[PDB]
């Protein structure tokens, strides 16, 4: 039901990039046209790690090649060229999300990866060792101690399917389109400051029926992102 | 109804040099104030930089050694005795990037700041938690605030942005009523220390500041009680129980 | 005095570990033997600090003497790699060992040498509490000295304090008797390595602990650090210890 991160994602709100961000109350034109076309908008939680995917039972790391640079052997474009490639020898921390097997020529169980996902109820996250094939064809977020200084306080390197966590009581952006409410920036900012989930998140990525996505980082909202300003993700209420 | 931080604040308990450690003796001024018929409201000490909203602008505190130069617009408000410094306040200087950064950003402003809007952390409607709220700076005019956030003291409170907090906002609960030591109870240093270690609010706070009807205040930092004050040893202020 | 064991030797791993010292799904032979003999197994939280003990009425730090160096004056051997295990009296430079004492600005040492700050279970076994205690109440017992200046305070403790080894009893920790042949019959449960790792990841207490130490009825002890389970230990991956639910 959720989309796949294969190209860059526009911002929910028009934001000027000062080389800081100068956010505005103006929604993305594409998002307005989609909401008026009748697409359902599912707000999901944006995590802070390194973009990956499972492709034919293997983990593939995202790599954006800039103009004129050597395309890595194995790169497969998807959407400043965006694409994915297989892991290299030096990708110690990418392979560390696999479950271990010291009696193997690789030391790894190549068919099992640790993941953080929703438990049987829809109330809390849980670490689970899943078959890597369960994530085939899906984009994931690799997170842990050695990625971004572990701003979520995760206890091990794990993958999280994008769109897993669905945000509760997030501002219904359809109320700012043709408009009942008009302060989309402040309302969203207030949701990240005073909601029960906001403090656990780096931002919000919207998943629509078109396969489109629209994101907002804490930096657009003039907010701080860090392990200090972040509550552990494993303690997030769902 | 809360006091304004204009002069250096005295300690609740007579401290002893070794580092200043609190002992089991209350401040003579606090004894005299409690006997003279004064109310004592324990508030929550937070860790940041002292400021105040004078007129409609934020003012940062600056202390001056009497044998120095007074900056333009500096306004004295008190004077220390131990160090002999001059207490006061200033209008923010160009370089106070993170002081100005507590204002609400404004795409329709020549500087990108709604100079009449600040982000502050205050008590919610019910009074059982703290919320971030964008407010008109005029509502804080005349009051002293503690500016906190990422770039101040290394954000020991785990705040999500630079915000202001009116001094005295967080009224403590179950904090020792320091009239029982002026005597029904004897160990004020043990009970006060036990409160920061084992209360539900202590773990979130840098210390305590008593606000009295006389305008007097008396403070106790964790360092007076021989405790650690750091983000590791502090639970986020925004999830403090009230 | 108290029913918990005294850390005077090295502690073996609950599970047979491989080689980075990672645990496998096989219990220690000594543990299986001890279990089958009918020993009571008490799972207790392992906390990251430094090993000490209250001897006479003084804090003593543990020091392992390598087989190629001299024994310090006042060093007591208590156990046996190739190094001895023993305890010393605190040296004048151990500023942060003495810092778990209650301060006293009127004493020669600046400390109340008869009172130490310790973290223990409160009246009702539902939470941990900091508690000023007469040091003589710990005489003979090994404690875990923890605080800001020990391992960078992965527990987020508001002060250097002592904790009697075995104070925190674990709830819902796998009962390792179901993983051992009972009257020769098949064990009721086969995957200890899996069940344990999921305890540290998804239990209510696991995320607050460095590991687990089983305190058996016969004085033996067995351990598992988060690393044995391929898990991270650090302040960011650890919830404050004083918030651990009991
Ligand atoms: N729920 C989610 N939906 C989409 N992208 C996500 C999600 N959670 C984390 N992300 C990541 O956030 C990135 C977008 O932000 P950025 O890479 O900083 O421009 C994507 O490439 C993803 O790897
Ligand atoms: N609730 C409060 N009441 C009074 N002062 C406070 C409060 N919270 C923080 N402070 C600050 O605490 C400082 C006094 O303690 P110290 O920093 O040890 O001199 C003052 O500069 C105040 O700005
Ligand atoms: N409840 C406990 N029981 C036994 N040892 C403990 C406990 N908590 C912490 N420890 C420490 O764990 C250490 C085990 O060795 P190591 O895991 O190699 O550091 C001992 O030296 C103890 O000081
Ligand atoms: Mg980015
Ligand atoms: Mg100060
Ligand atoms: Mg060891
Ligand atoms: Na990221
Ligand atoms: Na001072
Ligand atoms: Na302060
Ligand atoms: Na200051």
Measured between its terminal Cα atoms, the distance across chain B in Å is 19
CB-nearest to A228 from B112, B132, B158 is B158
Which residues in A lie closer than 8 A to residue B122 (C-beta atoms)? none
CB atoms within 10 A of CB C135: 21
The domain boundary, picked from B168, B183, B201, lies at B168
Q: How many domains does chain A fold into?
A: 1
Asked if B124 and B190 sit in the same domain, the reply is no
Kindly state whether residue A190 falls inside one of the protein's structural domains.
yes
The last residue of one of the domains, among C148, C166, C184, is C166
Q: Are residues B108 and B25 in the same domain?
A: no
Q: Comparing C-alpha atoms, which of B92, B103, B90 is closest to residue B61?
A: B90
Task: Name the nearest CA neighbour of B131 among C174, C32, A190, C9.
Answer: A190
What number of H helices and E strands is found in chain A?
Answer: 3, 15
Same domain for B95 and B134? yes
Can you say how many angstroms the Cα of residue B25 is from the centroid of all Cα atoms in its chain?
A: 23
Atom of ligand 1 nearest to the CA of A160: 8
| Whether residue C20 sits in one domain with residue C101 | no
Same domain for B105 and B157, yes or no, is yes
Between the CA of C186 and the centroid of ligand 5 the distance, in Å, is: 65
Output the 3-class SS for chain B: CCCCCCCCCEECEEEEECCEEEEEEECHHHHHHHHCCCCEEEEEECCCEEEEEECCEEEEECCECCCCCCCCCCEEEEECCCCCCEEEEEECCCCCHHHHCCEEECCCCCCCEEEEEEEEEEECCCCCCEEEEEEEHHHHECCEEEEECCCCCCCCCCCCCCEECECCCCECCCCCCCCCCCCCCCCHHHHHHHHHHHCCCHHHCCEEEEEECCCCEEEEECCCCCCCCCCCCCCCHHHCCC
Instruction: Give the full edge-to-edge strand order of the sheet including B75-79.
Output: B75-79, B86-91, B57-61, B49-54, B144-147
DSSP label of A209: T
Residue A139's alpha-carbon distances to A109, A134, B33, B193, in angstroms, are: 20, 12, 66, 51
Parent domain of B193: 1-46+170-242
User: 3-state DSSP call for residue A210?
Assistant: coil
Question: Chain C partners of B17 at a C-beta cutoff of 8 Å?
Answer: 105
Is A218's Cβ below 8 Å from some Cβ in B?
yes
Residue B47 Cα: closest atom of ligand 2:
9
- How crowded is residue B216: how many other Cβ atoms within 10 Å of its Cβ? 19
Q: Is residue A143 part of a domain?
A: yes
Strand segments, DSSP code E, in chain A are 10-11, 13-17, 21-27, 41-46, 50-54, 59-62, 76-77, 83-86, 98-100, 108-118, 125-131, 139-143, 158-161, 203-208, 213-217
Gap between the Cα atoms of B53 and B143, Å rounded:
6
C-alpha count within 13 angstroms, C-beta hemisphere, residue B212: 22
- Contact predicate C226/C206, CB 8 Å: no
Cα–Cα distances in angstroms (integers) from residue A8 to residues A70, A76, A80, B101, C133, in the given order? 20, 15, 10, 29, 60
Chains contacting chain A through 3 or more C-beta pairs under 8 A: B, C
- Report B:140-169 residues touching A (Cβ under 8 A): 149-150, 154-155, 158-161
Residues of chain B positioned with their CB less than 8 A from the CB of C106? 16
Q: Give the C-alpha separation, B94 to B199, whole Å.
A: 42
Element (H, E) at A92: helix A92-95
Residues C175 and C216 in one domain: yes
Residue nearest to atom 12 of ligand 1 (CA): A46
Going by their DSSP bridges, the two strands C50-55 and C58-65 should be labelled as antiparallel
Contacts of A199 in chain B (CB under 8 A): 160, 236, 238-239
> Quick one: C40 and C135 in the same domain?
no
Both B130 and B206 in a single domain? no
For residue A110, give Cα distances in angstroms to A18, A50, B198, C191: 44, 20, 47, 20
A199-238 as b/e: b if 16+ CB within 10 A:
bbbbbbbbbbeeebbbbbbbebbbbbbbbbbbbbbbebeb
Residue B188 has φ and ψ, to the nearest 5°, of -80, -35
Contact by Cβ (8 Å): A202, A48: yes
Give every strand in the sheet of A10-11, ordered side by side: A10-11, A213-217, A203-208, A41-46
Q: Are B103 and B114 in contact (CB under 8 A)?
A: yes
Among candidates A62, A149, A57, which has minimal Cα distance to A98? A57
Instruction: Tell the residue number behind the tokens 């002293």, with chain if given.
Output: B144
Last residue of a domain, one of B168, B184, B202: B168
Angle CA A215–A217–A218, to nearest 5: 145
Could you give the 3-state DSSP secondary structure of residue A233? helix
A100 occurs within a structural domain? yes
Asked whether residue C155 falls in the same domain as residue C178, the answer is no
Residue among B17, B21, B228 whose CB faces C159 most closely: B228
B153 and B40: one domain? Answer: no
Strands A83-86 and A59-62: antiparallel
Q: A127 in contact with C at a CB cutoff of 8 Å?
A: yes
Q: Is C10 annotated as a binding residue?
A: yes
d(Cα C31, Cα C23) in Å, to the nearest integer?
A: 14
Residue that has been written with the tokens 């689970």 in this structure? A128
Helix (H, G, I), strand (E, B) or coil at C33: helix
Residue C71 is given by DSSP the state P
The answer to whether residues C61 and C155 belong to one domain is yes
Nearest Cα neighbor of C116 from C88, C146, C151, C93 is C146
Q: How far is the CA of B10 from the centre of ligand 5 (A)?
A: 13
Resolution, given in Å to one decimal, reads 2.7
CA dist., res. C97 & res. B230, Å (int): 20
Closest Cα to residue C51, out of C157, C164, C216?
Answer: C164
Among the partner residues B107, B161, B231, nearest to A223 by beta-carbon distance:
B161
Strand bridging mode B49-54 / B144-147: antiparallel
Instruction: Please report whether residue A160 resides in a domain.
Output: yes
Q: Which of A62, A45, A58 is nearest to A118 (CA)?
A: A45
Same domain, B59 and B139: yes
Question: Are C97 and C59 contacting, i.e. CB atoms less than 8 angstroms apart?
Answer: yes
Tell me how far apart the alpha carbons of residues C143 and C61 are, in angstroms, rounded to a whole number.
10
Task: Tell me the C-alpha distance between B129 and C227, whole Å.
Answer: 38
């Amino acid at each position: 039901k959720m989309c796949e991160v294969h190209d860059k994602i526009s911002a929910i709100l028009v934001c000027a990039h000062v080389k800081k961000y100068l956010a505005t109350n103006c929604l993305n034109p594409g998002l307005i046209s989609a909401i008026q076309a009748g697409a359902r908008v599912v707000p999901t939680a944006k995590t802070d790690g390194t973009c990956c995917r499972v492709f034919n039972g293997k983990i593939q790391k995202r790599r954006d090649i800039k103009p004129g640079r050597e395309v890595p052997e194995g790169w497969i474009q998807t959407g400043h060229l965006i694409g994915f490639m297989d892991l290299e020898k030096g990708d110690k921390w990418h392979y560390d999300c696999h479950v271990k097997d010291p009696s193997s020529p690789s030391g790894l169980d190549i068919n099992k990866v640790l993941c953080i996902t929703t438990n049987k109820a829809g109330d809390a996250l849980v670490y689970e060792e899943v078959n890597i094939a369960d994530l085939n064809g899906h984009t994931v977020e690799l997170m842990g101690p050695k990625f971004q200084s572990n701003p979520h306080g995760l206890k091990a390197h794990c993958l999280m399917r994008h769109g897993t966590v669905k945000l509760t009581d997030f501002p219904d952006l359809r109320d700012y389109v043709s408009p009942l409410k008009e302060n989309a920036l402040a309302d969203i900012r207030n949701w990240f400051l005073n909601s029960k989930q906001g403090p656990h998140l780096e931002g919000v990525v919207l998943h629509l029926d078109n396969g489109e996505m629209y994101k907002l980082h804490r930096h657009h909202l003039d907010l701080e992102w860090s392990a200090k300003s972040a509550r552990p993700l494993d303690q997030i209420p769902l």
